[PDB]
Amino acid sequence: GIVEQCCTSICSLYQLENYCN
């Protein structure tokens, strides 16, 4: 989930937008 992609590893816009409604 988001912690693995954005906190434990380097976040990206592509990934962040996966969590927008």
Next chain:
Amino acid sequence: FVNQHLCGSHLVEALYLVCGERGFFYTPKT
């Protein structure tokens, strides 16, 4: 901004700014 390790409130705030009026969901335990 986005291209870094973002945790906790820092991650929530990035979601807020990027997602804007779409809103977002924050699910840390998946």
